[PDB]
Every structure is written in C-alpha cells, then in structure tokens.
Motif scaffolding. Sequence first.
Motif, short mmCIF file in Angstrom:
data_model
loop_
_atom_site.label_atom_id
_atom_site.label_comp_id
_atom_site.label_asym_id
_atom_site.label_seq_id
_atom_site.Cartn_x
_atom_site.Cartn_y
_atom_site.Cartn_z
N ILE A 101 11.80 8.38 -10.03
CA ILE A 101 13.44 8.20 -9.56
C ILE A 101 13.82 7.03 -10.45
CG2 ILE A 101 14.65 7.60 -7.68
CD1 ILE A 101 12.90 8.89 -5.71
N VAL A 149 17.19 -0.04 -6.83
CA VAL A 149 16.16 0.83 -6.23
C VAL A 149 14.80 0.41 -5.91
CG1 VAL A 149 14.54 2.79 -7.00
CG2 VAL A 149 17.08 2.79 -7.60
N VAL A 177 12.16 0.56 2.58
CA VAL A 177 11.92 1.87 3.20
C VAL A 177 10.24 1.76 3.40
CG1 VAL A 177 11.37 4.20 2.83
CG2 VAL A 177 13.53 3.07 2.23
N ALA A 178 9.48 0.95 2.42
CA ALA A 178 8.11 0.62 2.65
C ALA A 178 7.76 -0.20 3.75
CB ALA A 178 7.50 0.15 1.49
N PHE A 206 0.63 7.90 -5.61
CA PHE A 206 1.64 8.83 -5.74
C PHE A 206 2.94 8.32 -5.40
CE2 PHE A 206 3.02 10.64 -1.74
CZ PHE A 206 2.53 9.72 -0.66
N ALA A 264 4.24 -0.05 5.02
CA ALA A 264 3.31 -0.32 4.20
C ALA A 264 2.95 -1.82 4.04
CB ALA A 264 3.89 -0.05 2.80
N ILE A 319 6.25 8.52 -7.78
CA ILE A 319 7.77 8.83 -7.25
C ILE A 319 8.72 7.80 -7.46
CG2 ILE A 319 8.95 9.37 -5.14
CD1 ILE A 319 6.53 10.86 -4.11
N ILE A 320 8.38 6.85 -7.27
CA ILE A 320 9.22 5.65 -7.42
C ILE A 320 9.66 5.44 -9.00
CG2 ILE A 320 9.61 2.93 -7.48
CD1 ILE A 320 8.17 2.96 -4.77
N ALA A 365 0.85 -1.04 -0.08
CA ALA A 365 0.11 0.13 0.03
C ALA A 365 0.95 1.37 0.02
CB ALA A 365 -0.99 -0.12 1.15
N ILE A 366 1.71 1.38 -1.04
CA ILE A 366 2.46 2.45 -1.23
C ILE A 366 1.78 3.79 -1.73
CG2 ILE A 366 4.46 0.86 -1.61
CD1 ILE A 366 4.58 1.71 -4.68
N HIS A 367 0.76 3.54 -2.23
CA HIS A 367 -0.36 4.75 -2.92
C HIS A 367 0.16 5.10 -4.19
CE1 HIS A 367 -2.20 4.55 0.86
NE2 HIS A 367 -1.94 5.50 1.56
N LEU A 384 15.43 -1.23 -2.12
CA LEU A 384 15.61 -0.31 -1.21
C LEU A 384 13.98 0.28 -0.96
CD1 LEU A 384 19.13 1.49 -2.07
CD2 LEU A 384 18.52 -0.43 -0.47
N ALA A 385 13.33 0.70 -2.22
CA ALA A 385 11.86 0.90 -1.79
C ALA A 385 11.45 -0.01 -1.09
CB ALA A 385 11.41 1.11 -3.12
N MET A 403 8.03 1.91 6.62
CA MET A 403 7.00 2.86 6.69
C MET A 403 5.77 1.91 7.06
SD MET A 403 8.02 6.03 6.44
CE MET A 403 6.44 6.70 6.48
C1 LIG Z 1 16.87 4.01 -4.17
C2 LIG Z 1 15.98 4.40 -2.91
C3 LIG Z 1 16.43 4.48 -1.80
C4 LIG Z 1 15.08 5.71 -3.32
C5 LIG Z 1 13.48 5.49 -3.38
C6 LIG Z 1 12.96 5.60 -2.04
C7 LIG Z 1 11.76 6.68 -1.71
C8 LIG Z 1 12.13 7.80 -2.36
C9 LIG Z 1 10.30 5.89 -1.86
C10 LIG Z 1 10.44 4.40 -1.99
C11 LIG Z 1 9.60 4.00 -0.71
C12 LIG Z 1 8.55 5.06 -0.81
C13 LIG Z 1 7.59 5.00 0.37
C14 LIG Z 1 6.82 4.00 0.64
C15 LIG Z 1 5.43 3.85 1.33
C16 LIG Z 1 4.98 4.87 1.70
C17 LIG Z 1 3.70 4.77 2.39
C18 LIG Z 1 2.47 5.42 2.00
O1 LIG Z 1 1.50 5.71 2.82
C19 LIG Z 1 2.87 6.98 1.55
C20 LIG Z 1 4.09 7.14 0.51
C21 LIG Z 1 5.37 6.21 1.29
C22 LIG Z 1 5.83 6.89 2.69
C23 LIG Z 1 6.42 6.13 0.08
C24 LIG Z 1 7.05 7.41 -0.25
C25 LIG Z 1 8.28 7.42 -1.08
C26 LIG Z 1 9.39 6.35 -0.70
C27 LIG Z 1 10.00 6.73 0.48
#
Ligand SMILES: CC(C)CCC[C@@H](C)[C@H]1CC[C@H]2[C@@H]3CC=C4C[C@@H](O)CC[C@]4(C)[C@H]3CC[C@]12C
Lengths: 380, 388, 390, 40, 199
Positions: free
Chosen positions: B281, B319, B326-327, B273, B332, B277-278, B269-271, B322-323, B330
Amino acid sequence: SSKYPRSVRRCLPLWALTLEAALILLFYFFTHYDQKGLVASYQVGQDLTVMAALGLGFLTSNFRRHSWSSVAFNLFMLALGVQWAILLDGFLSQKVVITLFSIRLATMSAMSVLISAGAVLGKVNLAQLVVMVLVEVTALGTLRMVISNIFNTDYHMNLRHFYVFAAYFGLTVAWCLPKPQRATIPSLSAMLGALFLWMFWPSVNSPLLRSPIQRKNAMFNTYYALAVSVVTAISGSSLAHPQRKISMTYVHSAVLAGGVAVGTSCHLIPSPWLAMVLGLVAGLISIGGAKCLPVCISVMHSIFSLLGLLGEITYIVLLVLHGFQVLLSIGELSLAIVIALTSGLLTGLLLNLKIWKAPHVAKYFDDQVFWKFPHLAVGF
Amino acid sequence: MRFTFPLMAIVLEIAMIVLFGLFVEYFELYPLFQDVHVMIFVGFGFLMTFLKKYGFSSVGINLLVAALGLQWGTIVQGILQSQGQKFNIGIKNMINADFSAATVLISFGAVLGKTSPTQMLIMTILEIVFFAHNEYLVSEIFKASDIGASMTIHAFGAYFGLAVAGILYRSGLRKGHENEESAYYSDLFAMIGTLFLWMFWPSFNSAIAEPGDKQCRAIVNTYFSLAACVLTAFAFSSLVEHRGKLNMVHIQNATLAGGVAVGTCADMAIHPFGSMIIGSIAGMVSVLGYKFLTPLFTTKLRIHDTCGVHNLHGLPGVVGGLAGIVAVAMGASNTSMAMQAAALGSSIGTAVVGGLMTGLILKLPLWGQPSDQNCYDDSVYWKVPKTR
Amino acid sequence: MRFTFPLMAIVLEIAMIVLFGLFVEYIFFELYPLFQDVHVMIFVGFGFLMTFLKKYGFSSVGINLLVAALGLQWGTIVQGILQSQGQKFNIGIKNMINADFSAATVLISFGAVLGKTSPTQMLIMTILEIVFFAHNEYLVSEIFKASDIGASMTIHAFGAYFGLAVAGILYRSGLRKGHENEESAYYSDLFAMIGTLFLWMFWPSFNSAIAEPGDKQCRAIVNTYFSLAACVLTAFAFSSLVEHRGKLNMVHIQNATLAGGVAVGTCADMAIHPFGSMIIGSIAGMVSVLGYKFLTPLFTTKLRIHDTCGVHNLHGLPGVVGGLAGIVAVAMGASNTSMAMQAAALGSSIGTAVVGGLMTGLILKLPLWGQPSDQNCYDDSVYWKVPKTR
Amino acid sequence: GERVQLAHHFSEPEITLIIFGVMAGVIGTILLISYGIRRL
Amino acid sequence: DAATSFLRAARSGNLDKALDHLRNGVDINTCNQNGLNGLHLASKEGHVKMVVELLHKEIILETTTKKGNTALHIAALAGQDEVVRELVNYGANVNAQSQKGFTPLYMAAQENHLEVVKFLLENGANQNVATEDGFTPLAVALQQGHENVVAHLINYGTKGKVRLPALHIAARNDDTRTAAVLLQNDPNPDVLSKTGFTP
Ligand SMILES: CC(C)CCC[C@@H](C)[C@H]1CC[C@H]2[C@@H]3CC=C4C[C@@H](O)CC[C@]4(C)[C@H]3CC[C@]12C
Ligand SMILES: CC(C)CCC[C@@H](C)[C@H]1CC[C@H]2[C@@H]3CC=C4C[C@@H](O)CC[C@]4(C)[C@H]3CC[C@]12C
C-alpha cells in the motif's frame, strides 16, 4: 517485425501485482513468526543482502546504456526471489517459521538467480526476469530436495552447490536467447560493486556452517584466497589481452575467483597456505579462460562456471583426505549439472514466448526500451 | 556577504563545543548505529544527487547538515532527557542524533536546489529543536509506540520541508526550471543512495527497539515491507507512465515507502503478511503521489517539492500512523489508540508550525539565497569542473 | 618489458604463499564488525577518494585494490614475525586488522605519488614500506610503549612523510608547473565523495578496532565521532573562507573532513572528553584546509615535492597535531603514558618514514619498472584499456 | 531390495557406476585404437 | 466490423483479406480509434507489399494520426527501412512535423536507426528542424548515446538532396503505378533535378 518496443502498461503491472498478491496470500496461509546474539545473526544476513543488491546490481552495470536496467532489475529480482524462496524452502523442507536464518537462506537462493541473470541482462525485460526468478528458485529447491532425499544430506546444507547451479543455469538460459559497449563511469560503478562483493564474500562462504570454529576457518581461507586471486587477476590481465593492457571488466569478474574456488571447501582447509595456493590456481585458471574461452556469449559467466567446476573438483580432492565417497560426490555434482542444464533449457524455451514482449535483438543493452527519457517521441 | 556562511558555521561549532563541555560527559547496538550512519550519510546524500547540476551541493550540504545535526540533536535530546542536567553519551544518543539528522535531511530534500548553505544551517538548528520537542512529547506525554518513527521523523520532516518550501515559494519556478532535470549518471548515483537506504532500513527501524522479540519483529517487518514495496512501486510506475515505461524517480524513491510506513508497526505483532500489505500500500501511495499529487502541490498549492519527499515520507508516514492506530484497534500492541492519534496529529501540527517559523526566518535576504535563474546549480557555491 | 609486472606479482605471491606455509597457523567474532568496517574503509574509501582525477579513476581504484591485497598479506607476515620473534604465530581478528592498517599506511603513501608511478613501482613500494612501517610500529608499541591507538603518528604521518619522500626523489621538472591530465571531473568528484563519506562514516571503527574493550573503546568511538562532526563544519567554513566569493572547493570537502578523524587517533582512548575531541577536529579541519590552500603549492613549486592527492594536509599535518595533542593530554592527565615516550614516538615515526621513503624512492628511480612519461602522467591509457566513451 | 539380500562392499548405484565407467573406458580405448589404424 | 477486419488484416499482413474487403466496399481511408489507417498499421509492421497495394488503391499518403504522425513517421520510429524507402519513393514528405514537432529523421535518430537516418538525409531530410522543446535529431542522438547516428549527422551536415526526385526514379524504372501515384500527389510532371532535366 517492429523494432519499437511494445507497450507493457498492462502486462508488467498486472503480472507484478498478481505475483505480489499471490505472495501475500501464501504468506498469510503458510507462514508464522519465530536472543542474545540477534544482532550477530542478523549481520550475516545483512552482509548477504548488501552483496546481493549492491555488488550484483552494479557488477553488471558496466554496460554503456544498460546500467539503470541492470541495477533496478537486480533489486526487483532480489525482492521477488527472497519472498518466493522463503515459501519454497518452507514447502520443500516440510507451516513455515520465519527467522533470520530462513531469511539468510532465501537471500542465498535469490543470490543464485542474481548470479544467473548476469548472463542474460541486456537481452530480456522485467517479465522474463520474473519468470527466470521463479523457475530458477523452484529448480534450485527441487535440486536440494532431491540431493537430500538421495544422499541423505540436509536440505539447507545442499545450498553449497549454488555457485555451479547458478553458473550453468545462466549459461543455459543465455544459450536459448536470440543472438544480438563500456563507459568509464559505469565501469567505476561496477568496480564499486565488485569491491563490495569481494569484501563481503567471506560472509557468503560461511552462512550455512553452525559451529563457530568452522566459520572462522572458512572466513580466514576465503579472505586469503580472495586476496591472492585479486593479486593474480590484476597481474595477469595484461597477459591475456591483445592490447597488453589491464581489462577492468575482466578484473570485475576475476576478483572473486579465489572465493569461488574455496567456497565449497573453506571449512576443510587446515592451513591458510593451501587457501592461498587455491586462490593462485583460481587466478591462473581465470587468466587462461579469459585467453581461451572466447576462441572456443558472456565470457565472465563462462569463466565463473569454470571456476565453480574447479571449486567442486578441489572439494572432491580435499574430501578424500579428511572410493564410494568420491562416487557419491561426483554423482551429486553430475545431478546438479544435469538439473541446472535442464532447468536452463526450460527457462530459455519459456523466455522465447511472444507473450512476454521481449525487446528486439537490435535494441539490446539499451535503457531506452524500459525507461522513460525526456524529449522522446512516444507511441504512434 | 561571502563571509556570512563561514562565520555562522564557526559560531555554531563554538557553541556546540561549549554546550558539550557544559552538559556532556561519558557494542551490541554499534553495528545498528553504523548501518544507520551509512544510511544517513550515503543514502540520503546520494538520493538527492539525481539533479544534473546539483550533485556537489546535494552531497556536500547533506554531509555538513548531518554533521552539525548529530551534535545539535545530541545536545537538545540530552537536555530534554536529563531536564537540564549533565548526561552521559551511549550508542543510543548517537542513534538519536542520526535520527535528528535524518529528519533534517528529509526536510532539506523538499527545498533542494533553492536554498543556500547558511539557510540549511539555520534550518537544521531550528528543526532539531522542533523535532526533539515533538519526539519528547510523543515518547513521554503521549507514550505512543513509534519505534520506527514514521510520524516523529518521516512525516515531521516531510511537512516541515513542505512548509519551508511554501514560505520560500518562487513564482518563477512554478512552471519549471531548466536546471531541474536528471541525468543518466546522476540517476545512477541516486540508485546508489536508494539501494543503501533500502538495504540498511531494517537497522534504522530496529536500532532503538527493545532487544528480544521486538527488535527481531522490527527487522523482519521492515525487510518484508520493503520487499513488497519494491514490487508494488515497479508495477505502479509501469502503470502510470506511457507505454509501461519505468520512471527513475519512482524507482529511486517509492521503493523506500514500505520502510517508511512500517516503522510504527515495526515492533508490533502485525505478522509478515501484514507488513507486506503495508509495504504494498505504501508503494502504491508513493507512486500515485509522485505521478499526480506533486504537480498539484507545485502548480495549484504553490508548494514545490524538489525530491518529492512528501510522497516518500509524509503520505507513507501518515499511512504508518494510521496503520499503528488500526493495529492498536486489532490488538497487535497494548498502546492507546487515542495516544497514537494524538501523536500523529501533534507531529503534523508541530512540523507545520516549525516549518512556518523556520521559513519565515529563512525568507530574509541575508543568507545569500540563489536567484531564480541560478537554482539547481552547483556553480553558485562550488567550483564546478569544466568537464562532466 | 611488458612482462615485468606479472612476473614480479607472481614471484611476490609465491613468496607470500611460502612465508604463510612456513610461519602462519590458525574476541574474534566480537571485533569482526570493526574489522569489516576497517576493510570497507581501506578498499572503498581510499580506493575512490583518489578517483577524483578525470583520466585516472581506473588506475587509482585498481592499484588501490592490488596494493591493499598484497599489503594485507605482507603486513600479516612481517607483523607476525615481529611479534613472535621469528617463531610461528596464530591468526586472529587483530592480525587482519593490523594488516588492513599496514595497507592503509601504504595507500596513504600511494596517494602522494598518484598518477606518476607504475603498478610495479607500487608493488615494490608496498613491500618496502610495510617493512619500514611495521618496524616503526613495533618500536613505538614495545620500546617506547606510547599510546597511539588511533595511529595518528604510526600510520597517517608515517605514510604521509614516506610518500612525500618517494615523491621528492621521483620528482619530475616537467610536472612542477602543472599537467593537463591533473584535473578533476564532476562524476569523478562524485566518486571521490563516495570514498570520503565511507571513510568518514567508518573512521570510529578504524580508531577503536584495537582499543581495549570497555571504557577505552567507547571513548575512542565517541571522540572520533564528535571530532569528525566538528571537523566537517570547520572544513566547510574554511573552504568557503579561502576561496573567491565563498565558493566551496571539492578537494577540501573530499579531504579535510577526515582531518578530525586523523588528529583524534592518539587521544582517542584518552579521556580528553567530547569537547576536547571537538576542539581537535575543528583545528585539524582548519589546518587541513589551510594546508590545501597554501602549503601544497609551496611544497610543489618551491620544495620540488608534488603531492597529487594532498595527502600531506590530510595525514601528516593532522598526524603531527594528533601526536602533539597526546603529549599535551599526558601533561593534562588524560593518559598515564610518558610525555617523552610520546615525543620520541612522533619523532621516530617522522624520521623512519623519511629515511624509508628516500630509500624506496631511490629504488623506484631506476628505469626498470615501466615508469610513465611526463606527457602520459595521470592517464589510464598507459596501463588500462580505456573505453571510447565516458 | 526385497526380503534379505547378501551385503556387498559396493552398493547398486556404486557398482553400476563402476561398470559404466569400465565400459566407457573400453569404448574409448577401442575408438582410439580404431582412430590409430587407417592413418599410418 | 468489416473495417475492423480490414485494419486487422493490414496489421497482420494478410493482403488477400484486405483486398477482399476493399473489393466488398470497405473505405480505403478507414482508421481505428487512434487514427491509424491501414497504411499506418502496414508501415508499423514492415509489410511492404501491403503498403504498395494500399498506395495503389488511392489511399491518402499524408494522413496523420491523433499524435500528428504520418506513415513515414511510424515507419521511421518502427525502424522499417524498406517501408521508409517505399514511402519516400511514392512521395512521402520527409520534413513533415507531428503535433509536438517530431520529424521522421528525429524519430529514426532517437531509436538508433542508422540506415533510416542515412536514407532520409540522402533524400533531403532537414536535421535543423527542431521540435517544440527546441531539440534536434543531433541533440536527441547525443542524449541517448547513439554514437553512430551522431557521427553520421555531423559528417553529413547540409549536403542536401543527393537522390533524384521520385518521379525521375519512376521514369527510370518505367514504373507506371508509382508515377501515377506521384502525379496524383504532385500534379506537376516537369519536376527538375539538380542537373535540370525533367523525368
Ligand atoms: C492508510 C491506512 C489506513 C491503510 C493501511 C491499513 C491496513 C490496510 C493495515 C494496517 C494495519 C494492518 C493490521 C495490523 C495488525 C494485524 C494483526 C495481525 O495478526 C493480522 C494482520 C492485521 C489485522 C493487519 C492487517 C492489515 C492492516 C489492517
Ligand atoms: C505543509 C502543508 C501541507 C500545509 C501548510 C502550508 C503552508 C505552511 C504554506 C504552503 C503554501 C504556502 C503559500 C504558498 C504561496 C504563497 C504566495 C506568496 O506570495 C506568499 C506566501 C504564500 C501565501 C505561502 C504561505 C505559506 C503556505 C500557505
């Protein structure tokens, strides 16, 4: 004026990145997420996407030295148009819930712009195409909202006028552009695109119908009308030609005549023979337009507009069988035509601005303006 | 010897027949499998047809490699899942076979124009075993969520091909080659492949997803990630070139980076938007890689990537990993961050080791390797027509 | 006369409209993706597989489109008449699938006479061959009651043998030793690869479109998939084997890779097993490559039968392997069908194709349809406006 | 409108479109008649 | 800042402002950061009168930019036929090569500037001159699909200088300014035509 193209190293990247950042911000602020037939519902949208990318990118790639730009710019315009149409349809029909059906509707909205761009490809750059995409999506959404407010129709169901809106918008934008060819392999690629469009056009003839019976009847009618139109178009290309041969470029546009003719009334047709008659009439009208419209810029876009108007007219004829109803339908058609013409004039006026760094009139229909090639002198 | 390739292909086919007879027995996901199939055989097949004198070899070896790959991947994956016992074939077995073929084709994209069909058969046979073992490790021991396979397929195949090309490095090809050049119609065919991959990528990322919320999330995330990736790839391709000229390699390849990098977070559930963004990038990273890192790898690191599959699969794959990490951070997904990091590291390491071993095997002058002058030429293995 | 082709096409379209108005009225959505895959096969794969000719791509793809578009309508009419015994019938997804099957048979026959016929001749051949094919298919399905769910005998062998029969009747002495325009091109072969890949990918849906849902349809899908997988490897190996210095031949790669899909059709729903399917694909590929290498020159030079696309080695010989596999399968318990019925179906398909081909070719032999000259064969300029540049 | 108005078979857009169509037909007839004169 | 204003006036075609700056004491041979002087900027934008006025101000005709391009190279790449004619009439070298080996004929051929190609070929441009990569104007015209340029290059071949020398043309028209510029560039006043007659 210098015929050498101006540098777009700072205009196009900044413009595209700003557009993408704005789209991301709007999606973050205004969009939200959300079974048994998930794949079945996804297949219709996938067919629409396949048409919009493949067929509408290669159909205009018949140019000798402008196939790269046609295909890649069609892909870019589709990618921008779907993202902007999601937000616009969410705004004008109300946050925005993103489903497969909304993606399908945005794909149709982008298909309108992709059809319009065929009249202007080879004479504009990517920034002008971005401006055209944004303005045309906004204008189509405004037209749908006005029709829904006036005629008490549904905003998502007003997307049926997209054939005529796209055709007249493209013609109006091409009219405002400054005044200014084929090869075998680009023609074969355009034939591939036209074949994909012809095969998957029944999907675009019933994406808005809810009941399965109406969708099935619409698909039947579209299939048979498209077959009849293909037969008639391939037959009559020799008649409407001074060289008495078959024109491949004419076939590329006239394969879809029956699907355009029955697009607005495919659910109302009660028997496939009527759809076949409509397809035959569409093919004959395409032959007549190809033989007459050049005498009295894009011939294929003009015959597409004529076919869309004929489809609207036969919808008017069929709606009575299934006074004030005719007046409402004719007023809706006239409103769509007027809004399309006005928006096309506005888009053409905006596209003539010097800030867009438009290609020179002597450099039209050339990929050298927008693409890198080896062994070329660059800069001064 | 000219009889090496047909003899090896016949022996491999007989071995596949015997293995199917020994271990293999007997509609909602079938359209997804068909979309993946069209991807694997048309999109990857024609994406490598950008070479002016290597279209025939690219498409034919793509077809042959994927056809052998589906069978061998079916055998190996069924053995791994059944622990040596007999297994039944469903739509998911075919989907995973196409996934293995995708990984092998990603590796083949690195060594395009410098290898023989016999070398490609051997590389397929070894790389399927390595990829299937790594995928089984990630799916069962680590239990990480890689439903789009950014790490197990894309990064694995990219680094496998990089290792194979590094072992198979040619000193004469470091400064460039005359046949290593694109053509107008060849780039148009490459656009055919690019468009097919771009359109059918959501089915690729959602073929094996859990039906319901996860599959729809994967479809939507892949769709919007690709949509943002196209715009960012176009913008940065205009940015990195002189006078804002668009580069056909960038448009053909970097537009799929959003689909590559959204695979790990497809079902999360990264949404929309976040997916956009992914994808943005990923497109930026792919264009920057094609502009700068590929010459660095070719000239300084002595790693020649013909199709630039590193900037399309490995860097977007890292990428995506790593995403996913991070998820997980976060919230997700309920997967473990350490398991995701271990999956990414194991994928990269197994890819490097397997590519090393496979390239060492292929380095033997027994498979009809082309000379330096005959690289990127169809005339080595095909009957080229006189006219273009 | 230059007005013969448009007049005949308009008359045929009006006849189709009248027949649809007289006899045609209104599981579908479940089999719709299979129908779409078959549709993509028929119109893209077969359309571009014949685009390998350097100066005949336009005619190949355009006549493929026109012939298949007329063929779906005429096959719908004839098959509905045969199934309804002259009464009105409803249209479902299966009617469209069978119409695409009839179009496939007509395109298989057209592949034999590519570059030597006019569009008017193709319209006439479509009209006659659909009637012959539909009668043969009705015979096999109802009187013999044989299992041909992939139609190796009723479609592939029938179209191949019907096409060879028209091609022998339409045989021209000037073209026996070869033709300058009868040559391939690099990008033309690339387009042929597009068609080959599309046919190869969507063949399992072709073999499983009308299969019984459940075990039989999945068996057809799996068998076609693995048969094609083995067929590609065997076709590549034997193409390298039969050519000098192990060179791969583009014709072999474009055509013989589909032989496994052709020959597995009869045994698609049968429980042959994946291994049984991979054995047939490996053989079908070997037979197709050997045919393209040796039998096509023997047929062209000695028998006065010229096959432009080599559709014999792709559809007829693999079709006979497919029919032969089914008799063997019934013998081995894969199917409860009758061995004698399968043999009778194969023989009736071959005989009906050759009788229909000779009579269609006799009709087409009349100098009334604008047949091209020997010097203008395999040329788009006879019927199309060719651009100056390639 | 405002308050209570008598119901009619033709709505206001409908009746104004009918009136405009009748006016356009009359204008076209007059123009055709004028075009007929001064020629014969 | 005055030199920047002069360069901007040269680029925009404001001849009065450029003449005022030259009267004030702005150097005629000043150039921007890319090496483009007033003549280069005038040639890029098709300002023929500015080119003539700057040539009358004893500007260096054979000045090269940081890419090695002369005024004739820039005029041929920009497709300014009148500027190309004016530069050739004042003694521009039609066979000058840039840093990477490009010639004005190559630049005109790669941009489908058929009129410039015709004028350069009639004035003695050698199409056999290749760049550092070995490409020729015919080769780059074939690569870019400029069919008319290819046809004209094939048909012309090596017909050579069919035009008169620029000094002969100046003497025919009694153009004292053009003749003065030509004699400033080439000190020899007895240049010979194909017939053997001096100006
Ligand atoms: C190479 C990598 C480290 C760069 C890309 C990582 C970043 C920019 C991306 C990948 C994981 C993403 C997050 C994954 C999940 C969520 C939870 C959602 O409810 C809001 C967006 C949010 C918070 C995303 C924002 C953007 C994010 C932080
Ligand atoms: C996959 C990448 C990112 C990491 C692993 C790189 C390894 C597998 C590869 C890439 C570069 C390769 C080297 C490149 C060049 C040479 C010189 C040659 O005369 C012998 C092999 C040798 C010494 C290679 C050995 C293997 C090598 C080190």
